[PDB]
Amino acid sequence: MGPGFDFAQAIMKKNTVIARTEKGEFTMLGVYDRVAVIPTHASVGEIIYINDVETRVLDACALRDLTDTNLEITIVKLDRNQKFRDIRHFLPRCEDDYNDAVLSVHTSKFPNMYIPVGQVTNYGFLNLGGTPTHRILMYNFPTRAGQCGGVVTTTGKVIGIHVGGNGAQGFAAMLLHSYFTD
User: Fold this and answer.
1) What's the Cα-to-Cα distance from 166 to each of 41, 102, 157, 170, 171, rounded to whole Å?
2) Helix (H, G, I), strand (E, B) or coil at 5
3) Are the C-beta atoms of 49 and 65 separated by less than 8 Å?
4) Does 94 participate in catalysis according to the annotation?
5) Residues 30, 87, 179, CA angle at the centre, nearest 5°?
6) In the chain, which residues are followed by a C-to-N distance beyond 2.5 Å, i.e. a gap?
7) Is 25 tagged catalytic?
8) Active site annotation includes 72
């Protein structure tokens, strides 16, 4: 409807796949080459389904900060025959607050879903399903089961992936450029 949705749509159409694990279907953001991200609670194993294709996982890493605190981001390298468009130049370098964010989801359950979530707070610490977690972004939208892995964007920036909610607020794990240096 506006340039927020325009940027979000451009990311969804070229840089997302449907990831299925034993824990369900997730929006999965491709970042560059065969490297993608997914919430750590997806429990990625040796094999994952990508758009319903059986795919070997060549490497997977559950990120933690240098306090050895969960970040709830898993970086996955896929044995896929095709590279993602490189979107690393759209990742923020530092922890920040944002205005006017969109949360975008693409699964069997929620195809082509775009949610204007508004103002995003650098929340920091969250007890997420009982796990102490750092670098959490918060937005005032009642997000639901099925939106995990959803991409959080502003005009010009890919800032996070949806990892939980409490019925009134939603929570995303930050994406930082430094996670994807090669």
Assistant:
1) 16, 18, 25, 7, 9
2) helix
3) no
4) no
5) 75
6) none
7) no
8) yes
- Please give the sequence-ordered ranges of beta strands (E in DSSP) within 40-130, or none if there are none: 47-50, 53-64, 70-78, 98-105, 113-128
**How far, CA to CA in Å, does 21 sit from each of 64, 99, 102, 103?**
21, 33, 25, 22
Q: Choose the catalytic residue: 41, 106, 134, 162.
A: 41
Q: Which is catalytic among the residues 25, 72, 106, 162?
A: 72
Residues 6+ apart with CB under 8 A from 44: 21, 38, 57, 60, 74, 76
Q: Which amino acid is at 136?
A: I
Give the Cα-Cα-Cα angle 111, 105, 118 (nearest 5 degrees).
Answer: 130
First vs last C-alpha separation in the chain: 36
In terms of Cα–Cα distance, which of 110, 151, 115 is closest to 5?
115
Do the Cβ atoms of 73 and 173 come closer than 8 Å? yes
Resolution, expressed in angstroms to one decimal: 1.5
Question: Which among 25, 106, 134, 148 is annotated as catalytic?
Answer: 148
Alpha-carbon gap, residue 80 to 33, rounded angstroms: 9
What type of residue sits at position 161? I
Place of tokens 């690393």: 88
Q: What is the largest CA-CA distance in the chain?
A: 41
The approach used to solve this structure was X-ray
Residue 30 pairs in a beta bridge with 36
